Design a protein around this ligand. Structure first.
Ligand SMILES: CO[C@H]1/C=C/O[C@@]2(C)Oc3c(C)c(O)c4c(c3C2=O)C2=NC3(CCN(CC(C)C)CC3)NC2=C(NC(=O)/C(C)=C\C=C\[C@H](C)[C@H](O)[C@@H](C)[C@@H](O)[C@@H](C)[C@H](OC(C)=O)[C@@H]1C)C4=O
Lengths: 541, 540, 541
């Protein structure tokens, strides 16, 4: 230590000790990780029930659901959706003999864990699970058996032991409803889904941190329970009734693919970036987009317009110019460009949405050894929306053209995607289709915004990179304080939350226009956690 | 079920760790409030936001929205990474009694540098930061976008507890903006003259407002940052009237006022050290290795383009460059530019040559596109090379021509005016400080050779890009009165004098001529009193 | 119609103040960053002693050890292990005149900092340090001199000034024992390690945050000291004796490479992902795997089976088919495939583990200019285990075949890896080799598991992606509360923690089977910090 600091200190005011503290004796307890097998029940929806009844387990928290993924054998393309564990959850319910204590919808549990990288990884996020593997023979192993762990985040984990679920000498039932296996699987037509669906069984195990407490001093607390309201298809409104004490309100959009066969051209697999989705789509198209053939290429529909690339290299599709230059092309062969690989239009001789027009430069070298074109660099304007268009909409009734002018080989490689937690109108939820949000508490306008400033606040306040337009009414510390809520006024009709959105106007000649939307409104109501005590007499009969 | 061993294991006063009394908080109601400002115009843009409402009792979490316009026309254009923070010059929160809290643009950015989410919202995408090209005068270079800048204040530390209370006073939030030149990376082709004339800052301030029923206001303490920028290249800077300081930060900034702010390359959205280097290598390669029918044309007379021998090795003095290109036509030969960029202060002395920084170049010539497709490059190019302004290659100090590149390459040079660059390179990799000496009055307060104060700053703040910082306060904020370095007016200990020893560079290296500026940041303690409106008082 | 009401707060007793707090006056103190040079001692093991003796250093925390890495000159391949700073630490000991206050093993300090990205970076994680650099001339600079910073995390940093180590007018000694330089260096046979080991010296400097406190009010506290027990080689048990008050128990595996020369085929350098390890291995093998030669290739052992690739492109190695197609092959030359690059078999008529059979497609273009094959795309089933096999195990006595059928050029590029902190049986600790864990407190079974649910909990509760099978007993916030421990019953015999694992069964014909294992058990015991007659620690019993 230098002299200047010594002189600065070398009087007597009431000071708080910042260099020592009294190590308070905590409640005498003992934790233990407890694992239990359930009871399976079977629209023949799979339901697992876990009963927790023990004199020693005083309190419990940190629920983790294990799932045994079986060995997948056979032919065809198969892969699991990212975070497979969360995606196979439809509903989680924690109940006692008095009724439901806390419950959540599958998507909401996922939304609550979206900022937890570790919980998402344990759930099932690997190249082993999420890459689309191919089976060549009926006995070939597509996927090896694996175990996934789903962190069932509850309000009891917030402040560890302080927030824990205290079993007041009663039975606790944890009920897990599962989504059909079709929701968690990405497969092609070649894959035998019918056999798989029948043969597949959900193999769960519930784990939790149990606490054996000596002379526990139980006190009443407060809990936030989530409620979900899904609006009418393509309707820009949704209402949450009986709102008396709400801590938060979330608003988001979901696509509805019930009007399609849920088939999509491409899928990136484990690689989940916006660029990864785009690159996978470009790769799938390139095979049919630029062809090196001896004369006019064969195997394409009559509707297809495959033009020979001039010496200039530029092929003009209306106003759009495509520069195609392939090296080491054999003298007997020529370079061809598919000028209408995928096209859409609602009126004859009108605006046409052509996927071939979304390319500006294609360069590569022809391989004599593999009889394939090895593409070097592609200049395109392909977006996340293009990769998110269901194949059905290209060949829909609304289209005046054939639509899908790809080869039968390409069409056979299309994958079924039935992920239950998709948001917006694209796989990455990039496109914001809400131009204005209006929240009304009864007749009075509670909140309005054009830009997603509520989403920006949600992302900041929750340290999340994928948030939703959320209104937070509670800025008080949880567990130690009674949560602040938006309070109702039944007499003035201020007992409901009415959400109204203004959807972005889309072009009728773009296939995304026909993707149906659903408004999702999530409300977190406040409940009081009480512990029933008293004497009851019963007539012996 | 619980096992027998744990059961067997289980008058003393014990604290309840399994239950707590859910305390009734102060009755309040939060609301996200958004306001439009008042624009004022060296004709510097200033946005004023006035906050006053009988129901807005307190506020925190200031977020500034910015409407980036559609950019149309010809040329290369892109935004600097974290565009939102970069366009902020100064933020000032004041009342009728004066300024409550204020910050310089760079300091606000420095405070949010460890916040990934805040940085992303600010504007960090391929859509904004990649250098896009406009082909026709009506072509859209950049689509309109909205960016969100988190104005981190001392009021967010402990949420409602730390929040700024409004004692029936008018709170003004003043945002001074940097010129649009600082947030834009563009080439000569881009019509910046029209862009600068037509561009307008479109701001909107958002904050979390609180309606508090019967608020019980108490006095608090606030840390306000002060910045002192030293004389260009001067290894000294002094902070006067230091009476109660919580911290002191020291860093360096480059100065490019002696250049045209033009640089050869830029990686765009990809911001790693390797990304900067790879972009530079890519830009030089087409001029470095030429496949031509006879001696290549279009280069200055000063250029020394040598034909690559059958051996493949071209010797530039002591440096050997292996150049081997596949599928070269019979009528054409492989050439190496042996002096692409050169610098020297004397005619027969040491030369800094960029071509000598290459050891192996391999590729395949494309007959279809008439260009060389490079496979693998072995080089010793560093982050400093990518950070040299073009002006320094053709400077007066240089005995050589300097820039022996083609007119095509020179036309692709980009103007970079990022206001928050640190050190002498874009990634602030090179540490140019050999010694730090901090004096309080006349006495040496702290002395260091290695950047151990930076290592402590990075550890204690969980940041990967920190500064040489002396922290005097290790006491928890809000709940305690901050610990400070106290002054002695009588003894003369009322100023912080920083003296550095810059590491000396080679005069024959162009980086030597990059001007430096020493930045000293001091955080003074102020008392916040709500008697007769909101007012701050300097602890002395 | 476009107008929407802009109204504020449209949703409106002893109360705790949530909008204001009393700014308590703290203890009068002054911090200072203090740096000290040590005293080097030399089994000739390196030991650095730092004596802290000052009447004004009242308390201290945040220990940071600086290390001056020298300029590395000469020929051969050389690079440092990632996080070089932590890897050179063997043991850290903080002691006073009364004895040891706190101490840690090198690996445990690293384990405690594994979730701290910043601390790991400061330690030495750069392309400059970790990439394997090559020296061409005896005076060529391989590595430039560098300074690394090792954050010696102690229990005194938990609650900053509150948790800080107080110096009761006593001399505090910080002793740092260093691992041999062999442990922190990755080099080939060409590199003169004999001279390097002789010329290398550890150049340390200890830094800490010292606090000069005016009228300090010292109070007794509690400290957790880690204890490590390493089981006998290939022994599935390990016991921790005298367990009286433990806060946690960690169990993990380590490989033992003493039965090998510590040489490995490949190393990715700075790039440390699972894919980076795999890609580096594939790259190293490709040079010998696919050969473009004028007639049968030379330089390989007689044991090697190099087959000419047919016009078909398919080379069949038993039931495995390898598609090899190289472009621009000269007319005087042919394409060859090494069908047994690396092979292992316990019997002559048994299952043979062949690395060449792990490849399905190899495509590239031959360069006439550089006389090399430039590989475009490789389809393989190479895993993290393959990259983790020591070269010695390919040519071991157990193998009835030659094993290593690579060229002398490839074999000369093999690197010595002596990283002291490797876990599991692979470099990334991906493969879980424990099928069952049994923890006993005395003779009674305390905890048993099949799946790694204790590791899943460790990873969740500590927000770490690289955790260990850990049993936590303390769920109470440190420093404010007295830590909750598993208490002993000396009379009943429960005064020891006995761990037992059941290793997952591997195939005898796979070289990984012969990688020897060591069980590591870490126990954190509770000690009382008493400041009567200087600083001293007492074991809670
Ligand atoms: C909402 O929760 C709050 C408490 C109530 O919850 C209670 C009911 O459960 C607690 C739990 C679970 C705790 O772990 C602590 C306390 C309490 C409670 O009382 C403390 N209670 C006191 C007891 C003594 N008084 C007065 C005086 C003598 C100093 C102060 C509080 N100190 C306390 C601590 N800290 C210390 O002693 C030490 C060794 C250091 C403290 C440093 C600073 C000061 C804190 O870091 C500060 C930022 C803190 O306020 C937040 C971490 C948080 O507050 C918020 C708003 O976020 C609390 C956890 C605790 O660790």
């Amino acid at each position: 230590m230098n002299n200047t600091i010594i002189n600065s200190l070398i009087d007597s005011i009431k000071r708080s000790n910042v260099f020592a503290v009294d190590s308070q004796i905590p409640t005498l307890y003992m934790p233990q990780y407890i694992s239990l097998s359930g009871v399976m029940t079977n629209d023949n929806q799979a339901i697992a029930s876990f009963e927790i009844r023990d004199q020693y387990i005083t309190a419990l928290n940190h629920l983790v659901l294990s799932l045994e993924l079986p060995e997948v054998k056979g032919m065809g393309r198969f892969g699991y959706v990212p975070y497979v564990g969360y995606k196979c959850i439809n509903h989680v319910s924690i109940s006692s003999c008095n009724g439901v204590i806390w419950e959540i919808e599958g998507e909401e549990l996922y939304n609550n864990c979206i900022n937890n990288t570790i919980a998402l990884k344990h759930s099932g996020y690997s190249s082993e699970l999420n890459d689309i593997s191919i089976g060549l023979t009926p006995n070939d192993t597509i996927k090896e058996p694996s175990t996934v762990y789903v962190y069932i985040k509850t309000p009891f984990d917030v402040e560890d032991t302080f927030s824990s679920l205290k079993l007041s000498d009663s039975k606790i039932t944890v009920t897990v409803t599962f989504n059909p296996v079709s929701d968690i699987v990405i497969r092609d037509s070649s894959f035998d889904f019918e056999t798989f669906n029948k043969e597949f069984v959900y193999v769960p195990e519930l784990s939790f941190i149990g606490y054996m407490v000596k002379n526990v001093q139980i006190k009443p607390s407060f809990i936030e329970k989530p409620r979900r309201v899904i609006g009418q298809i393509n309707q820009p409104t949704a209402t949450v009734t009986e709102v008396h004490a709400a801590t938060s309100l979330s608003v988001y959009t979901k696509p509805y693919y019930g009007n399609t066969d849920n088939k999509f051209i491409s899928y990136p697999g484990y690689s989940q970036d916006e660029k990864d989705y785009i690159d996978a789509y470009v790769s799938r198209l390139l095979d049919d987009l630029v062809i090196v053939s001896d004369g006019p290429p064969t195997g394409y529909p009559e509707s297809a317009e495959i033009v020979e690339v001039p010496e200039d290299g530029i092929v003009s599709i209306q106003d759009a110019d495509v520069y195609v230059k392939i090296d080491n092309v054999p003298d007997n062969m020529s370079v061809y460009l598919h000028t209408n690989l995928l096209m859409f239009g609602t009126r004859k001789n009108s605006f046409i949405y052509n996927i071939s027009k979304k390319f500006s430069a294609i360069t590569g070298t022809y391989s004599d050894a593999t009889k394939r074109t090895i593409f070097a660099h592609i200049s395109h304007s392909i977006n996340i929306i293009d990769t998110s268009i269901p194949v059905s909409l290209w060949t829909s009734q609304r289209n005046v053209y054939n639509g899908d002018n790809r080869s039968a080989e390409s069409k056979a490689k299309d994958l079924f995607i039935n992920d239950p937690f998709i948001k917006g109108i694209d796989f990455k939820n990039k496109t914001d289709i809400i131009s204005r949000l209006e929240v009304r508490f009864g007749n009075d306008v509670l909140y309005s915004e054009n830009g997603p400033i509520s989403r920006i606040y949600n992302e900041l306040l929750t340290k999340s990179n994928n948030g939703t337009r959320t209104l937070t009414f509670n800025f008080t510390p949880k567990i130690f304080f009674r949560p602040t809520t938006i309070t109702a006024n039944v007499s003035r009709g201020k007992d409901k939350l009415s959400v109204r959105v203004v959807y972005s106007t889309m072009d009728v000649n773009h296939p995304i226009y026909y993707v149906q939307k659903q408004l999702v409104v999530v409300c977190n109501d406040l409940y009081k956690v009480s512990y029933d005590q008293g004497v009851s007499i019963t007539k012996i009969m």
